């Protein structure tokens, strides 16, 4: 419904500035907030109705020890938003407590806009995992948005650290971050950063600014998931009711992210889902299975192939999928985009909850086991020993991920129907 | 209840819901009248509405005074798939206040509230491709003084065929109300009693996996209908 | 020039085809009969492309040039039948060019072939690998859907992709009447189209696609049955002796196939590329069809009934040696033995009868005697 995003950390707010910057791009709006003559599509999903038919975007930036902030305001788009919003570290305990100071402020700027909105669904969290600043503040303010507000839903969309490593301390940040997502949030959409790089050193021959098209690509994600709210569809115009599909249990919430273009910086649809369930075109790097598939498709689509082709992938039997439950491969169908160029003209993308994360969520627990155990990683930081002279959350984290693991495990089993 | 009996409570929210679209005070949304052509007496998986268009008089005579009682049909079909997306989100709804720091009790209910979401939104995206995609393919392109009168009356039957109101596909529609039934059984409770929604979820699962083998079965009677044991089940006996 | 009549319950000597035809019987003892052809041409030509429309402004001529030839009191021959065939040449040309290029016969014709005449290996091997269980037992209701779904997606696996003349060849069950028994093939048609492929053609095409499925079949389990025994004794080499004794006769048959459809093919497109009358399509329709139909043998009768029995005992023999690995000792030998007299016997028997006189054909005999070894067998 509407929608207010959250910022935090240097590359979040990155990531939110490229989002912005996407969105201005998309619809047809000046870096003023002037409305175009060409603007009809929804607009209140994310943009605030201002007073001189101005769709100031809602958002709100927030800092910690800004350095790229700056750049941000030095830009034509730091006029586009913006409404007032404005405040002024390396580890997880150093950000947590440092978010734990100056909660009251930051929640005097989420209150206001709270009572400014006429409605909120949604509270979208743009911030890297052990990213630094992003790490422990997101973790702390994430406790306290679930606190505070029990009556709308969370989604992450995030970044996992698999980057392959000197910062060692990682495991244990994405470790204590990954608890509050497991039980603070209901989705969080995963992605690899390897998987990401490969392709983006597959398509030209980048070496160092793979960074800047991961944030068109994370920025054309994000607004694919709601081009069907912003432009009249039918179905997931509530984002719960596209949620609610691929989760069976609150535990199990990471989604699996593919994107058929892959350079993206016409087709036959059976073609472009059975290219879609590649590995290649999944930004994500025993037997695993599927709990459940939904895919978003916008472009140029035959209205009739889609019986068709959905007949096709289902006698095609390519896919293996869970015996306790009756789920779907669910095709749902939007709209391309107008007011922006339409190349690359077929675009699908996929959210899919499979037990395959749980190998990468293993990996970090086994590199998270070996680096505790041995104990020459944490180093016993001043900061994490203000924040816990008995370090016993990290091993309460440890026990909500093993719980995890086992549940991921039980649930690729076809014993699931009793708890694991 | 108190409110609902009249066909006039409910047609000032029509007035109240044009708004909210940025829809009202067109052509488009003129001569639109809401009525009920029931008392509510009941599991109550039926929905009581009828909507209406028409328009200005030398386009009227094509558009015939008995094809807007058959959209009046069709409209309350695809409403009585709606009233699952109600009672459904009512009751995880109720269910989340009993979160954070769950039990057994908590992940175990939501595993059932999981399967009965999924299956409606897989026939309501069903018909959400039957009535919408196929049908307005042949009445996009099907628009070329009487074959104007043809071609529309071609629309409608087409319109009711594959949204399986019709007799043919009768028995692939009579299982959803065993579907639709045990979900209004399961909207009542939160817990009262845990047990007593799981036994209504797994009469629900073996009324889904035979809705899979009825509508197989029923393609040797319907191209359309080929479809729709694929949405229901997927890779799935 | 319509087909219309004036003269009711009186015959005037004429009635496309049927309650169009010619009534042969009445006709006037001053007028031939082939000048009877022309008119019955004509009149069935021009209610073909009239109707269906809901063309030509000849009517005028006509109506002059046949006025013309009304006023005079003395029987011309040579005058009637000269204008009735200046009408009939430009007729034939219009109905040619309506047929020909409105909707592509070149298509028609290449689908024909890539399917009833197995045009394509990879497609049919896999059809054959996939739907094997189905087909191998007697037919049933349901079954004929699961084989057609099989025959798209065999399609599709080899990757020769097309829509549109892909559903017009749907696959055809009798049941009541092994599924392999009475698989059929039939394909759509529509009307500038509809003459050429009239049922009794497509009847005819049937016939060949069940041939020719049946030697295809035959082949690829053969070579199955000997792959699977030398992947893995006296017993276990005189089974693969008599599958290589099987297999040569089997491969040269179906490259004699091979063979007819590449010459007769060739004559069938040159002839309609090589003038524009109806009549060449007619006549070159009949030399493809005699010719193939020679060639498959069932204009003789026993060499047939040979060829049937070198195909049959093959089905149950390459059927019987999967299902075990190891030599057989109980009662192996016995039917190892039947077998190979029983072979012998029509394979002889057959090339007695190969020994129309057609160059080809014999020729093609030679090949196993140019070893004199296939001549003591």
Known sequence: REIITLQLGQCGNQIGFEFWKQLCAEHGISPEGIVEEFATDRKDVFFYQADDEHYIPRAVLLDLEPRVIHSILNSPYAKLYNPENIYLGNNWASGFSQGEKIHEDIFDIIDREADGSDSLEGFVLCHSIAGGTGSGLGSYLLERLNDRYPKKLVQTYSVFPNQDEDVVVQPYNSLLTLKRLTQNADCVVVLDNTALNRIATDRLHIQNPSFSQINQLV???????????????????????????????????????????????????????????????????????????????????????????????????????????????????????????????????????????????????????????????????????????????????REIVQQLIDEYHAATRPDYISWG | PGELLNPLVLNSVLSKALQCSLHGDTPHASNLSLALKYLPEVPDVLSCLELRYKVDWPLNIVITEGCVSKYSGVFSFLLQLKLMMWALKDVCFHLKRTAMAGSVQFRQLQLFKHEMQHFVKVIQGYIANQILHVTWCEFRARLALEEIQRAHAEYLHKAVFRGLLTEKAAPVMNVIHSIFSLVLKFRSQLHPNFALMQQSYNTFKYYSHFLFKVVTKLVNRQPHLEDFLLRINFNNY | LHGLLLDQHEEFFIKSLKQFSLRVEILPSYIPVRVAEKILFVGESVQMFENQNVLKNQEDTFAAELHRLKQQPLFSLVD???????????????????????????????????????????????????????????????????????????????????????????????????????????????????????????????????????????????????????????????????????????????????????????????????????????????????????????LLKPVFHCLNEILDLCHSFCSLVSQNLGPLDERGAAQLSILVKGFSRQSSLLFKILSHQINSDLAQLLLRLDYNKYYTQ
């Open chain 3, 80 to 298: 009637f039948e000269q204008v009735v065939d200046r009408i009939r040449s430009t007729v034939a040309e219009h109905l040619w060019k309506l047929m020909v290029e409105e909707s592509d016969l070149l298509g028609q014709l290449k689908i024909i072939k890539d399917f009833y005449l197995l045009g394509r290996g990879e497609l049919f091997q896999a059809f054959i690998d996939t739907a094997q269980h189905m087909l191998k037992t007697p037919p049933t209701a349901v079954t004929e859907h699961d084989v057609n779904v099989a025959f798209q997606q065999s399609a599709h696996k080899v990757l020769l992709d097309d829509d549109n003349l892909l559903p017009l060849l749907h696959l055809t069950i009798e049941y009541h009447g092994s599924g392999w028994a009475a698989l059929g093939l039939s394909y759509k048609v529509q009307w500038p189209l509809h003459i050429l492929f009239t049922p009794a053609v497509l009847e005819k095409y049937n016939v060949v696609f069940k041939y020719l499925l049946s030697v295809r079949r035959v082949q690829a389990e053969l070579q199955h049955c000997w792959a699977l025994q030398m992947q893995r004794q006296t017993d276990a080499i005189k089974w693969r002796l008599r599958n290589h004794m099987a297999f040569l006769v089997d491969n040269l048959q179906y490259y004699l196939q091979v063979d007819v459809l590449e010459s007769q093919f060739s004559q069938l497109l040159h002839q309609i590329n090589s003038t524009r009358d109806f009549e060449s399509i007619r006549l070159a329709h009949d030399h493809f069809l005699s010719n193939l139909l020679a060639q498959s043998f069932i």
């Open chain 1, 219 to 397: 920025s054309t994600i994000m607004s694919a998931s709601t081009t069907t709210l912003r432009y009249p569809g039918y179905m997931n115009n509530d984002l719960i009711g596209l949620i609610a599909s691929l989760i069976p249990t609150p535990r199990l919430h990471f989604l699996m992210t593919g994107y058929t273009p892959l350079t993206t910086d016409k087709t036959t649809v059976l073609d472009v889902m059975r290219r879609l369930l590649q590995p290649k075109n999944v930004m994500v790097s025993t037997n695993h299975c599927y709990i459940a598939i939904l895919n978003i498709i916008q472009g140029e689509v035959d209205p009739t192939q889609v019986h068709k082709s959905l007949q096709r992938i289902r006698e095609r039997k390519l896919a293996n999928f869970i015996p306790w439950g009756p789920a779907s491969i669910q095709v749902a169908l939007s709209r391309k985009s107008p007011y922006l160029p339409s190349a690359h003209r077929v675009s699908g993308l996929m959210m899919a909850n499979h037990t395959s994360i749980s190998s990468l969520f293993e990996r970090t627990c086994r590199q998270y086991d070996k680096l505790r155990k041995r104990e020459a990683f944490l180093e016993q930081f001043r900061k994490e020993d203000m924040f816990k002279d008995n370090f016993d959350e990290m091993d309460t984290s």
